[PDB]
Design a protein around this ligand. Structure first.
Ligand SMILES: *[C@@H]1O[C@H](CO)[C@@H](O[C@@H]2O[C@H](CO)[C@@H](O)[C@H](O)[C@H]2NC(C)=O)[C@H](O)[C@H]1NC(C)=O
Ligand SMILES: *[C@@H]1O[C@H](CO)[C@@H](O)[C@H](O)[C@H]1NC(C)=O
Ligand SMILES: *[C@@H]1O[C@H](CO)[C@@H](O)[C@H](O)[C@H]1NC(C)=O
Lengths: 49, 112
């Protein structure tokens, strides 16, 4: 379960851009401000190999 | 007195920031998730690092397709008052494969 990708990004990748950031993102309207839940599904998902 | 630059987006350890520290022509460059002080000065995931009025220095910095490009020139001058007229062309120094987003910058000074 370790190998990882961001399931979302709030801006699409520039050519050869990298992004380490651990932001939860707005998956909806509400500013969740560090909460995970509806409007805020944390993006760094992983494969199940 | 002028000895470096900060470049990046949030500039606050939440993401990578290109830091250049210089003493004329020897240089340290890093891109790491730096936590700076609130007033940046030089006292008289760390994925990239590199190491190298009488006077005018000129530079052009541009960030394209995941590479950061620097051009420069040095010359002595006579106009103390302001940016001088006349013609000169900068030449490339370095091209760094750093892969980073940049929307803000700040200059770094050596203080007592
Ligand atoms: C590079 O970084 C900037 C932040 O400094 C990103 O700009 C923000 O993008 C969002 C949309 O994703 C906007 O809502 C904000 O208003 C933007 N802020 C600024 C200061 O412009 C920018 O999207 C990033 N570039 C890439 C390609 O990810
Ligand atoms: C430039 O400053 C760094 C410390 O920030 C130092 O390691 C380096 O030796 C200095 N080089 C010169 C030419 O003074
Ligand atoms: C690099 O990212 C990890 C989380 O993936 C974090 O724990 C670590 O502190 C970061 N390293 C630095 C130098 O900030």
């Amino acid at each position: 379960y370790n190998y990882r990708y961001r399931l979302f990004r709030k801006s699409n990748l520039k050519p050869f851009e990298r992004d380490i950031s651990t932001e939860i993102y707005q998956a909806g309207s509400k500013p969740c401000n560090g909460v995970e839940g509806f409007n805020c599904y944390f993006p760094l998902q992983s494969y199940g190999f | 007195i002028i000895r470096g630059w900060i470049f990046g987006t949030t500039l606050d350890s939440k993401t990578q920031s290109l830091l250049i520290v210089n003493n004329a022509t020897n240089v340290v460059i890093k891109v790491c998730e730096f936590q700076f002080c609130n007033d940046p000065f030089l006292d008289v995931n760390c994925t990239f690092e590199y190491v190298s009025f009488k006077n005018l220095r000129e530079f052009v910095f541009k960030n394209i397709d995941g590479y950061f490009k620097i051009y420069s020139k040095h010359t002595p001058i006579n106009l103390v008052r302001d940016l001088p007229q006349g013609f000169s062309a900068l030449e490339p120094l370095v091209d760094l494969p750093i892969g980073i987003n940049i929307t803000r910058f700040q200059t770094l000074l050596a203080l007592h």
